Design a protein around this ligand. Structure first.
Ligand SMILES: O=S(=O)(O)OC[C@H]1O[C@H](O[C@H]2[C@@H](O)[C@@H](CO)O[C@@H](O[C@@H]3[C@H](O)[C@@H](OS(=O)(=O)O)[C@@H](O[C@H]4[C@@H](O)[C@@H](CO)O[C@@H](O)[C@@H]4OS(=O)(=O)O)O[C@@H]3COS(=O)(=O)O)[C@@H]2OS(=O)(=O)O)[C@H](OS(=O)(=O)O)[C@@H](O)[C@H]1O
Ligand SMILES: O=S(=O)(O)OC[C@H]1O[C@H](O[C@H]2[C@@H](O)[C@@H](CO)O[C@@H](O[C@@H]3[C@H](O)[C@@H](OS(=O)(=O)O)[C@@H](O[C@H]4[C@@H](O)[C@@H](CO)O[C@@H](O)[C@@H]4OS(=O)(=O)O)O[C@@H]3COS(=O)(=O)O)[C@@H]2OS(=O)(=O)O)[C@H](OS(=O)(=O)O)[C@@H](O)[C@H]1O
Ligand SMILES: [Ca+2]
Ligand SMILES: [Ca+2]
Ligand SMILES: [Cl-]
Ligand SMILES: [Cl-]
Lengths: 498, 499
């Protein structure tokens, strides 16, 4: 027995602050039911804490660092291009070859160039944000009720702002309990309260999709994967490698096979990677998992939980940095490759009130040492956290002789992973890639990489990159589509940021 | 459970097995014959490259040279252009060092990455080699290590020997040489054929010397010897090219105290193996785990039954930019040509050799047969496919014949599977710093599109030494650069006379 369809319900920027995880701050009845009749994973760790790196990893089936897709965002300009290897199959292409209809409604946001019609054959693409393709809305549930499909539905998750419905409860910022590493500021409490409100909106949106499936008699035969790309928007969640930056909600539901999926436990606490989502989607559909994919079928008789899970952070917008984390059963380890750069480096959230207010308290000397660690001008080279005693990860154990054995063990796990994958974050980005950062962000970039670029190009620094550099021609095995929006997504230059 | 005490590679340059153990009795090769008779002889060992630095880099890292960006001959030699192996990576010698062995390589390394040689070879010191390579210094290894388990390599000149004045070397008449049909019959071509036979005798003498040194130090029985060459001989469709005798090399493995164990699957092994299986088999015999990322297998494991196919790759060679991949199955050799617009006779380092001039002269005069003239045509086919039982000289391309379309597609997809799983770095253009390194060494000899474009983009610095154009690359924190003087010497690759 196998499901007829695979569906990813794919949310942005959301942690599982809902009833199925035991949080009754707000009411999330659809999610609670959905989890009760499916399999809920309490230890699903995405390989990145930011959109394009996680989404590129999951769609290619490998850590984003292995194929050079790690930098958020990259390969968007006309003059800077990453193409997947000749013969390579992304997860949608594997479903296409097996005869499925494929679609992704909403953003792709992949850090390579591609003919979208080869991935998603059931609808048209259009231009998205910052060089991304988006898939157009269409009546997927009716058009494909008699056609096996692999689909994705992109939802806003933590990026929702529409709280005007009568169903959205009051959440008092004054009654929020903030973790000890965040400054207690009005805008920080407000974002905490707002993230709870987005749980109700995700609950509503989950209900909409299940109803559409039921109305078209494809509820029973569809395996749904329900997860987010990374944690919520505050400064030590999204963009960072702590527990709730990368650990995401995940529920898997296949009503006609629910007893099979539940065999290993309806609540799954073993370590899995987000990379196991595409591998399990293929296995459930009956499609061989390519040898080069990193993920596993989490429902196979052989799968007993990962010994460790890796996450990676690299460049984010104009913030150049590199760090890697190893999560074992009991510890989280972070290796910092730029200890000379502050975690409070300039970044895209710098004009948000929650960031302004926190930084202000730091400069006035009013933060606790736990709150101020983020703002110190340097980082430790290694962090190690005992997650049972220190779930907020505020007690670095890496300098304690009692923990040197665990530190060395985690340090070598990372080395094993770098050696076998040749982590491409070890190598500096090309000058053409730096120019793409400058096209989009201009004077916001203050990195050593950007200052070096400007010194080297005094006559063209503010000229749009597609007037400085020749376009990259696409490979013979993947000709460039003539579809107009492929030109649109490459117009990344923003005059206002120069 | 028995294991040899030592591993020894007898590592020859540019040599095909034209010796008695392969049935060739043109000259007498008694040491090689006896060595093969008492060991295991491999008749289908295919190196992953037809040129020195690409093969040697592959075998020392345990992976296809194309996977780690080591495929371009030569690369990573200058001060300003550097490839470093990944953090945490273990080369084959490093694995032996960690297991407590003494390690050495006497003669050239010629690897396409930067490295602290002392971490690979802990029993002797390096010195400056040719074109940016490290060389290992000569020392009395057999006496120094007769009581210390070791992994050693002894580099021999093979086909590059050219001192034939010893009384031990027979006369070989160029007029009685039989050349293959794709070579022009010219005096200098016949002369190189005869010379290659003479180098078989020189390799035979040297093998006997090494076995005697081992026996003189009571390490003959407890040493597993791997006897092989890095690729085929120097003529134009052997070395540098992906035909059968470019990449298929001699290989004998001999471990006298384990002789019955090694022979269990056969004293003559015709199954397909890769040169990458040499380091993997060396590790397994010594009892060292083969890393998960290595490509090779233990050819003596009960599970090993021969590869279904073997891949070889050619990329840049000196200033000749090109890219081609071959798939060798039981019956066929397939070649995919990624630059069909470039002639196989495009400019290359052998252009001033008389055997090359004489053959090209015959081409220009219209005196070559169509089989001889194919090499000199202005374009290459996009794909080549040869039935090796019917066409061992690979002179009848089957790729355009409908009877062979199923095999063509089968081989084409084997290559695609391998590109997808390894991310073949030859798909990507070399950096401007890497191109400048070619220009330092070869100057105006480079006429490739890459070099012409580099000059067009650097019109004021074309002949300035690269180390004056580009800042030196700093070595990673996990592998600091040694202060040893010769490390600066090997980076001086600029040649004024070629500018
Ligand atoms: O230009 S950047 O945002 O700096 O690009 C870098 C950034 O891109 C991705 O995230 C942003 C994008 O998804 C864009 C798409 O338009 O929207 C951004 O959200 C904007 C604000 O950051 C956000 O403020 S916040 O209160 O959530 O923190 C939000 O603000 C709107 C709301 O306040 C509503 C009601 O309250 O009123 C609006 O006026 C506010 O918009 S604003 O006045 O223009 O600031 O919505 C903003 C735009 O949304 S819109 O409806 O399309 O107009 C995203 O930034 S976000 O803070 O992260 O959500 C990348 O996110 S990803 O990795 O998840 O893909 C992000 O990492 C970074 O690359
Ligand atoms: O500068 S290059 O050779 O163009 O570098 C590119 C080349 O390097 C590798 O192979 C060469 C090197 O190993 C160097 C080391 O010095 O020597 C080269 O051999 C020289 C001649 O090419 C060779 O021509 S041959 O057809 O006769 O074999 C040979 O010529 C000598 C003989 O003819 C004898 C007998 O008359 O007299 C000598 O005077 C000749 O030497 S000459 O002064 O050049 O006329 O020997 C030469 C140097 O030999 S010596 O020991 O220094 O005295 C190698 O080129 S070879 O033809 O392929 O052997 C690369 O080879 S590798 O992949 O195996 O490492 C090669 O691919 C290429 O990169
Ligand atoms: Ca997101
Ligand atoms: Ca050689
Ligand atoms: Cl976005
Ligand atoms: Cl360290």
């Amino acid at each position: 027995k196998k499901p007829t369809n695979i569906l990813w319900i794919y949310m942005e920027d959301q942690n599982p602050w809902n009833n199925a995880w035991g949080d009754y701050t707000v009411s999330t009845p659809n999610i609670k039911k959905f989890a009760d009749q499916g399999v809920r994973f309490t230890n699903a760790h995405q390989p990145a804490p930011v959109s394009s790196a996680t989404r590129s990893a999951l769609i290619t089936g490998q850590y984003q660092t292995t194929l050079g897709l790690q930098n958020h965002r990259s390969s968007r300009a006309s003059y800077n291009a990453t193409f997947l290897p000749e013969g390579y199959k992304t997860v949608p292409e594997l479903f296409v070859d097996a005869g499925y209809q494929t679609f992704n409604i909403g953003k792709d946001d992949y850090n390579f160039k591609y003919d979208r019609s080869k991935l998603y054959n059931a609808h048209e693409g259009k231009a998205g944000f910052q060089g991304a393709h988006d898939g157009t809305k269409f009546d997927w549930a009716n058009n494909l009720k008699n056609k096996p499909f692999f689909g994705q539905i992109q939802l806003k998750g933590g990026k929702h702002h529409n709280f005007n419905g009568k169903d959205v409860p009051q959440v008092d910022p004054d009654k929020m309990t903030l973790p000890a590493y965040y400054a207690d500021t009005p805008a920080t409490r407000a974002e905490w309260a707002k993230h709870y409100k987005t749980q109700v909106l995700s609950d509503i949106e989950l209900g909409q999709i299940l109803k559409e499936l039921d109305d078209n008699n494809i509820l029973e035969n569809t395996a749904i994967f329900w997860f987010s790309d990374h944690g919520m928007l505050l400064l030590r969640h999204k963009q960072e490698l702590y527990e709730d930056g990368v650990k995401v909600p995940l529920i898997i539901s296949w009503p006609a096979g629910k007893e099979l999926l539940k065999s290993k436990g309806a609540v799954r606490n073993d370590l899995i990677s987000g990379l196991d989502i595409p591998a399990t989607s293929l296995a459930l559909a009956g499609i061989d998992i390519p040898s080069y994919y990193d993920g596993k079928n989490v429902f196979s008789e052989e799968f007993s939980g990962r010994d460790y899970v890796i996450s990676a952070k690299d460049r984010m917008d104009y913030t150049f940095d590199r760090a890697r984390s190893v999560r074992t059963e009991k510890y989280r380890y972070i290796r910092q490759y730029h200890p000379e750069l502050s975690s409070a480096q300039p970044q895209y959230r710098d004009k948000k009130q929650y960031s302004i207010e926190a930084r202000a308290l730091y400069e006035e000397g009013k933060l606790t040492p736990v709150q101020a660690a983020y703002y110190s001008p340097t980082k430790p080279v290694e962090e190690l956290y005992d997650l049972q005693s220190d779930p907020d990860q505020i007690k670095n154990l890496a300098a304690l002789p009692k923990y040197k054995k665990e530190l060395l063990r985690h340090r070598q796990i990372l080395l094993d992973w770098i050696a076998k994958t040749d982590d491409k974050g070890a190598y500096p980005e090309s000058e053409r890639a730096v120019k793409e950062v400058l096209d989009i962000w201009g004077k916001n970039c203050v990195s050593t990489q950007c200052e070096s670029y400007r010194l080297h190009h005094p006559d063209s620094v503010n000229i749009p990159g597609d007037k400085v550099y020749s376009p990259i021609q696409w490979p013979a095995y993947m000709p460039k589509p003539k579809t107009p929006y492929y030109s649109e997504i490459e117009h990344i230059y923003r005059k206002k940021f120069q």
